[PDB]
Amino acid sequence: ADYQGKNVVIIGLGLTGLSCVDFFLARGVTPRVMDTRMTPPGLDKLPEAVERHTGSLNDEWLMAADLIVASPGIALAHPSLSAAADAGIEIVGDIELFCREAQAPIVAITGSNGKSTVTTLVGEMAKAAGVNVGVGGNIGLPALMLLDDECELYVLELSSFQLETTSSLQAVAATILNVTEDHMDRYPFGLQQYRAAKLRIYENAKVCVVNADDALTMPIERCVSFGVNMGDYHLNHQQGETWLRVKGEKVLNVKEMKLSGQHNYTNALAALALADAAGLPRASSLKALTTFTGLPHRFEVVLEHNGVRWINDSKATNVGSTEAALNGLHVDGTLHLLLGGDGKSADFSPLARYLNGDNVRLYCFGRDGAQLAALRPEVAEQTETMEQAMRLLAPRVQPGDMVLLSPACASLDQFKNFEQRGNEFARLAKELGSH
Numbered sequence: 001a002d003y004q005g006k007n008v009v010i011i012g013l014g015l016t017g018l019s020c021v022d023f024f025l026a027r028g029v030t031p032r033v034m035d036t037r038m039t040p041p042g043l044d045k046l047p048e049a050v051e052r053h054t055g056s057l058n059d060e061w062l063m064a065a066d067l068i069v070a071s072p073g074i075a076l077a078h079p080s081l082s083a084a085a086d087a088g089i090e091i092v093g094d095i096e097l098f099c100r101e102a103q104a105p106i107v108a109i110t111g112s113n114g115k116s117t118v119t120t121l122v123g124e125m126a127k128a129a130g131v132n133v134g135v136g137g138n139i140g141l142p143a144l145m146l147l148d149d150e151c152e153l154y155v156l157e158l159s160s161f162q163l164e165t166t167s168s169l170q171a172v173a174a175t176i177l178n179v180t181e182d183h184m185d186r187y188p189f190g191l192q193q194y195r196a197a198k199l200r201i202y203e204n205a206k207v208c209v210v211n212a213d214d215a216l217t218m219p220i221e222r223c224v225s226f227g228v229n230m231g232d233y234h235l236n237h238q239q240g241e242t243w244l245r246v247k248g249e250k251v252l253n254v255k256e257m258k259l260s261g262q263h264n265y266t267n268a269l270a271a272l273a274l275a276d277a278a279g280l281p282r283a284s285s286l287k288a289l290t291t292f293t294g295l296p297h298r299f300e301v302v303l304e305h306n307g308v309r310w311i312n313d314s315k316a317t318n319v320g321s322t323e324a325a326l327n328g329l330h331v332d333g334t335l336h337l338l339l340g341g342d343g344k345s346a347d348f349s350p351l352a353r354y355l356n357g358d359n360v361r362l363y364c365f366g367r368d369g370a371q372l373a374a375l376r377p378e379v380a381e382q383t384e385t386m387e388q389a390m391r392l393l394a395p396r397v398q399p400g401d402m403v404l405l406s407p408a409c410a411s412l413d414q415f416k417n418f419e420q421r422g423n424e425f426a427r428l429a430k431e432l433g434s435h
């Protein structure tokens with residue numbers, strides 16, 4: 001594509017919006033920027049000669065544009081944006097701009113849970129093979145900051161939102177890892193509309209990788225599959241140990257992995273299937289599986305002291321993700337579970353199954369605290385903030401217990417993002433968790 005002379009409007013700042021600004025400027029196009037927030041992050045790092053409008057959308061600017069670049073954080077359904085679309089004004093996102101320029105194969109990963117782990121993993125597989133790889137998208141750097149002529153492979157985490165505005169992706173290997181309820185505040189046509197957005201990732205992909213255990217990950221020549229008991233990539237359980245297997249051949253005893261748990265093992269399978277489709281050597285891909293330590297805020301033990309494990313799973317920002325943490329979870333004594341924040345209109349009831357017995361306590365906070373507490377009121381306390389919940393639970397903690405921040409919600413009602421929320425839990429854990 002050629003943008004010269006075009007009237008360009010970027011909706012949304014932050015890192016991503018700033019990368020879009022720099023993208024256009026470096027191509028000799030001065031965009032204008034709008035953001036519905038009065039002081040969006042990065043405002044102060046915006047260059048002085050870029051026109052900006054904050055606090056709302058400017059329909060004069062939008063209806064004047066030749067191209068609208070919408071941040072994933074604004075709904076295409078927003079009245080101002082659908083007015084523009086009705087006018088035949090072209091609307092894209094950062095990812096779409098990336099895909100038009102990228103000069104290396106792209107491995108594209110989406111999913112309600114696991115997508116950051118799989119993306120990171122595939123990145124580490126490439127790195128183990130000596131491949132110059134750019135890893136990012138919806139994590140790490142925004143995609144436009146990855147763009148580099150010497151890159152030999154890109155591995156992009158993509159959200160449903162990014163996919164809605166992307167049309168030029170032709171992934172060398174693409175996956176939806178799973179589809180469980182999330183973002184319903186952005187999908188008024190419910191689960192199928194959310195699913196429909198993620199399905200876009202498969203269009204023109206050279207290989208598709210689907211989850212044989214989640215029918216919703218399949219499109220409406222076949223896809224490669226991964227699964228627990230079925231799928232081209234699957235698990236084989238022999239006698240307390242577990243193997244990764246490709247079409248009946250053993251490829252890795254999971255005792256060599258530093259990650260644990262069925263769902264991490266199916267993440268490994270997904271990563272391997274993607275790495276294989278991308279043409280990465282198998283040996284170095286397996287080697288990456290054994291060195292990978294996991295991501296911060298992803299079921300991350302921040303403190304083990306005095307018989308108590310404090311676990312930061314702050315990246316659990318949906319129900320499926322918390323359920324992943326709770327399902328099969330071994331706790332010696334009492335589980336003290338922190339739930340709360342912005343539940344994005346999710347049904348929390350699927351969590352109820354995991355909260356029976358004498359060994360669970362709930363500490364529910366933020367915007368949907370009352371709804372979370374209502375899962376089992378008898379064993380629940382509700383506060384306003386996570387710090388209050390931590391100071392409430394800490395005196396109760398006994399040798400053998402677990403403290404688990406796995407909130408099933410976004411942090412955005414009270415925090416900058418789930419990282420700040422994990423960081424704050426980590427600091428509090430260390431204060432509250434020794435004498």
Ligand SMILES: O=C(O)CC[C@@H](NS(=O)(=O)c1ccc(COc2ccc(/C=C3\SC(=O)NC3=O)cc2)cc1)C(=O)O
Pocket residue numbers: 011012013014016034035036037071072073074159161317409410411412416417418419
């Ligand atoms: O961190 C959390 O606790 C939750 C993350 C959570 N992720 S996520 O909503 O999928 C998400 C998507 C893109 C980004 C980064 O990029 C953005 C730029 C601008 C905006 C807000 C804008 S733009 C505008 O014009 N008016 C706005 O209020 C939001 C995001 C951050 C989060 C979620 O999964 O619930």
